[PDB]
Symmetry: D3
Subunit: 321 residues, 6 copies
């Protein structure tokens, strides 16, 4: 697996740096796409695969499969994916957004914000990114920013989530839950809350999980978004925390500064201005390299690069825990 990479520019001191090829996925890649801004990406085969949020010209929210040789240039299917489901009630499509994908043990799991009398977390698996078998929704509405851990945590599946409401939710804590079987969920634990505005305002309104947690010797590296409320709306930035390995609802370090915030025209102008919303990462433990995918202005998808050891140090050095 060769992950995408660009070397940190000369004299850049930032922990993460934007791809000079951003945006890597344009808003109009498909004949009917309005925007493409969640890219739930993983290695697959001799390349990469992913589940993409592609909102169409009707402003419907759909998920599409994509493939790529280099993880930068994507061939996304024109037709939305369809989930196969034994149960007619759960298998009913209303809408879907916020996908996340990860491989656990023997297959790829997809979670997404699935409408079922409100936003909840849908769950499906695939062996091949062609047929997807839909499982029970993991939780009762309202919930989103569902993000699985990439292995079992002491014998059970684990998921981060984000209790919400039925609108543009003005609050949001990260939570942790477990399941023995991808059907029945429990042992719910609070992970963290928005910071106080006077401490770290980029994350003081609400927060939610981003990429699949990345295992490091110093804890699970969580890349997560945070919201700040100005008089003219919300600004979405993102940052990092380290979670205990065995009890990942225990936050050990949490960054004060953001890692990335809306700065470039493609992040500050578009369907929802001033949004950097991380959705996936690819990483390489040998080199420490990480590549983070993020939606820009809810319009296009970008990539940013960093080193895991540098991120860990930044997280601990600036920690507000």
């Amino acid at each position: 697996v060769i992950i995408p990479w660009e070397e940190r520019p000369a004299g850049c001191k930032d922990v993460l740096w934007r791809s000079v090829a951003n945006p890597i996925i344009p808003r109009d890649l498909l004949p009917t796409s309005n925007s493409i801004f969640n890219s739930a990406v993983v290695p697959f085969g001799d390349g990469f695969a992913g589940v993409f949020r592609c909102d169409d010209t009707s402003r419907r929210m759909r998920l599409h499969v994509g493939f790529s040789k280099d993880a930068i240039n994507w061939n996304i299917k024109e037709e939305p994916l369809k989930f196969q489901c034994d149960d007619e009630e759960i298998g009913t499509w209303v809408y879907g957004y916020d996908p996340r994908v990860c491989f656990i043990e023997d297959r790829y799991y997809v979670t997404w914000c699935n409408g079922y009398h409100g936003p909840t977390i849908g769950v499906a698996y695939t062996f091949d990114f062609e047929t997807f078998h839909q499982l029970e929704n993991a939780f009762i509405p309202f919930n989103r920013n569902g993000v699985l851990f990439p292995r079992k945590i002491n014998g059970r599946f684990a998921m981060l989530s984000r209790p919400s409401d039925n609108g543009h939710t003005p609050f949001g804590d990260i939570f942790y839950s477990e399941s023995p079987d991808m059907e029945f969920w429990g042992r719910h634990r609070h992970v963290m809350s928005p910071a106080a505005f006077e401490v770290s305002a980029w994350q003081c309104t609400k927060i939610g999980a981003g990429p699949i947690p990345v295992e490091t010797p110093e804890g699970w590296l969580l890349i997560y978004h945070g919201v700040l409320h100005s008089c003219n709306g919300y600004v979405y930035s993102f940052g990092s925390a380290l979670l205990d390995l065995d009890e990942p609802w225990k936050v050990k370090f949490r960054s004060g500064p953001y890692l990335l915030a809306p700065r470039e025209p493609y992040e500050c102008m578009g369907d929802v201005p001033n949004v950097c919303f991380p959705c996936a990462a690819l990483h390489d433990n040998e080199t420490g390299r990480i590549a983070i995918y993020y939606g820009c202005a809810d319009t296009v998808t970008g990539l940013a690069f960093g080193y895991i050891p540098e991120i860990i140090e930044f997280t601990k050095r600036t920690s507000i825990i």
Copy 2:
């Protein structure tokens, strides 16, 4: 021997209020401000319950109570304290909205438990002296958690009511199952508030009340509904019938309310215009049912009816 009063003569109402309401006064304890949830079950030679008693600090606490007749209560002055092996879950913040039922071999208690916002707490007891707390069933925000009094195809089942962090302006009843009273899933929507032009007493939000009452025709669900006036919410309650095997499937749902705020003790107090049903005792032999409900979030009331009359009213006036 559950409490009973015959319908007044000439009264054609399906439910009739006890002539002795309120049956529990606001100031029964030395520091109680209000007492308005009564989660009542038969126990040993008499009755037991878990009661929401808000104190003079306006803190929300649960207290155990006992009664020989189910009308006159001796409520413990100390609040109930749960035992928990897990210190994280075992931390008390607040508690309201209790419900109590016997399932297979023990009594279970659910309540709206504070855990970074309202969720549904779960505990068991054999004796109403020691309570053993289990995992909270769901992530916040959730309340009106009401267990079924037996397993449904080999699993525990619970009605709930996803909510928000404040005075929630919405709310559907949901249904979930668990094999072990720890892990929960198979979530199914039961019902939504009605359109205001169909049935406005239940058009803002709804929530389950007493434990479901099994009948040959399905589960008898007594639930509250809210109407939003310019000067606030009005809580009334009514009746539905749920499928026996798949209780998320609603068979019949009443258009009219069974009861709504009328009397001064319902219409004046800490939260005016509230009738909030929280428990029921019934006898299948005679069809008699006795429904406990909170009045004005201040005091506790009792109402009477017959199960076959309620069922016929529910079908005849059904908006499904």
Copy 3:
């Protein structure tokens, strides 16, 4: 022979409540939850009315009533249906806020009629048994439609109250005309809520109540006003005098109210703290006026006064 009761001696109030209030109870009908609009007129050897009767489903429906004395009413159990040649307009969604007056050859009914939101429905009857529905007078959102009881310079005329899709937090009274009871126009603003520092009982929103009463010095308009407290709205009512020929021109408007919620039947009920005037009977010969009003959106009450006194009060306390 309009209803009347003498001024309690050593009462100096412009209006005084009937000692028999409430004159219509909430449960007069077997399925009524509340009865609090009574759009009353003389008819044959007695009186007839269209009443807002909300049922135990909290649906809003209109029912006909009859009475020998205008105090004790026999209201039909079944809601009235309108007859309409146009299927789209004749679709019933909900109805409230009725008003009734005789114009020239027949009685006209207006009400708040649901047609993709609140608007003003219009109908005529000759007999109070069959009602023929005409075009809704305006586009939503509008209510408190009140016809003048004769034409104003060759046209039908109506007061209205532009509103929104909810519990509207604003409301001016407007005036409109129509040559044919179908097409409406020449809209003119009558008045806006007062500044709270001047007259706070009518500072949030106002609306017309009774059919305007012709006096030789202009139209007596009895209208409700709303005050917004931290705990919701308080509805009181008062008086204005409109120019005879151009009734959008307000000549005098009272600073103080005439009546405000005081009694328990006004202060406790489905919507607390509401006195909402809906009709009036009067006798020019004696100057007597009898004013019907909804109490707490639950029951109907009556109040009495003298036209000349009300006019004097209106001029003397005028904020215009």
Copy 4:
């Protein structure tokens, strides 16, 4: 009558395409103009005339007359338009915006959102775009987006409107009404409501009529805006519907996708970000060509081009009715 036209760019598949000379009217055309973003345009004499919303440097909303040879380059009068009115109360000017202009039988009629104890629909006529005779306001407040039909229907004048409130209204259905005399109005009928967000979210908060309805054998072509509410405010897009010829409150087809939505910098940045608000169109039945004027970010005016038969085919094929 030679309407403005540019061909569809090479390989463009879109039903409408933007003028490459956008914006066609700049914000600062008049000495005190702040913004010029409604252009109610008609053929007149040997060229074109129009009534324009020009908000000045005091942010007052005024209407101005303009003229043009080619309908792209405009000479707008510096002085605001004054209406003559026989009734001094109705003739009182508080503010005006949202103009629309059309010729009905023997004269041009102007409607606008006119302040009369709140927004309502004002009405006037002119024969020459010099003297304007003000008629009665058509409706009681609150209402705007008044748009006349360009001929009588069943022997009456007809007008689409849009019941509103006293603010930045968070709802809005399109209504239809008739008048025998341009004075008394009635026979009010509901045309359509915002769509469900799951179905077509660009038009799920509110909608309102745009250009004068365009007669086709297939019904009235209505171009209308719709609003989507994001966390960061409203996004105005526009689309198309076909109304029954004889009973125009009856919608026959209604597009799922939008025709145009904010995409270019001049639509995304300015006084009100993310607005494409259609206001007028010129069309030529012989060729099928249509040119649609629309306000961009409440700052400038743009043009877009299409073919009426293609628009109708799109409206039908993608219909949500």
Copy 5:
């Protein structure tokens, strides 16, 4: 000789309502709609006060009252007019929330005075006949202004409550000093609403009531607290002890309330569920204190207690 009624036998309550409540009715004056702030002090061989009397126009005015026994009040019909040499500050817009205390050589009156929004008006009087207006103490928005009854280290001192332009959803008590009753500063935060899970009767906002009472253990502050239900605000009141020398430092603060809306005259009226303390008379030799408070923003009521008992209560139940 302060008013006094002994505690009923068998009552463990720290305060008890007078059995003759309400002591001032809503209709005492010819045009009074409600009378519910009574800023009372000893004066001559009896008592005086400034009273908030809202009229039938719902305008908020202040009127002077006198009483020989402090229970039965003769309140003047004419609103009080302040004399002021500056016409800008002297302009009357509205006035409510009065408080009155003697400091050194005269009586001082504070009130919520409209000056482009609510702020704290200040005046003095020697005789309760002429009132001389001083500068408003603060910029809007502020109210619940309450002076200390002597200087604190050579300065006048005042508690206040920063607010907004509406029915304020927040509110901390602050402390400020002035050398000269014109320029104010050294602002210090006294306290904030409590967390709802700790003491919900005081979790939305709080504000000072009676003039602070000097005790050997600190200043006894009686203050109101607000709880926010789905149906509005509930106003209760409680006690704190402030440091004698630096009175922004709170030493003790009651978890429970001392009094909360319970009787019909507190629960029903213009603003339901309000007990708003506004003044207190006390006798240090016997420990007796008589607390005046508004009831449902309609009438005025009286409650009694013993200062040593209130202190012990405040200490024993302190949440700090």
Copy 6:
């Protein structure tokens, strides 16, 4: 003192013109700066000094001292400034923004929006822009936009303020207060309220003082911001008023039009879009030159130039009183 100046562009008829080198202070000037958008600038020594609002990458609001030879190119201290205070209660730092600086008789005074149980006006002095001595907060919360007068008025210090609330306040009048000693404040007077929307909508939601009042023979020249509320948020523009010399709460003239409104990409895009927030001015009575510093989009700092006599004449001739 040689104040920065650029000559009025040929053809330009505006009363103020933007520097051709805007933004003069970039958002990333400091190693940890997210945005730099208030520049409270004064002559000092052989050049200029200032207190600057620099929000960091944690989105904390801090004040930093800066120095410049020319008042355009600034050397801002990396470390936030710290206030010295004898009282521990008042000396507690929670947050600070909205700085203003002016020399009064013998020292420089700094005001800012200081957190003390909500937003209030902090006050400090400095002789050297190295040590700052904090005084009592001038008012009880909630208040901001505190701006001292640059000399005493009838023997007293004087300050403009702006009573607010605990959020993004949807209202705002300018008030005036006095103090004999920079400790006790009083004699509060209403200066002005927002204008009616039908008169001057750029200033109809709220208003607040900007630069230190500039004394002229015709009154105090107040440059102030005004807010307009669109469906998509607030737009901040600024204009001018003349206050009576002896009783500065008496407004004598107040402009109808604005002087400046968000127009350029650096005013329209950034952390808070569509904001032009004036915070300071340098002026020369001999030449009438004035240079006005202003925050752009709450991101960067810009400069604009004008002539005081032109501004006085514009203010009077366009007066809405």
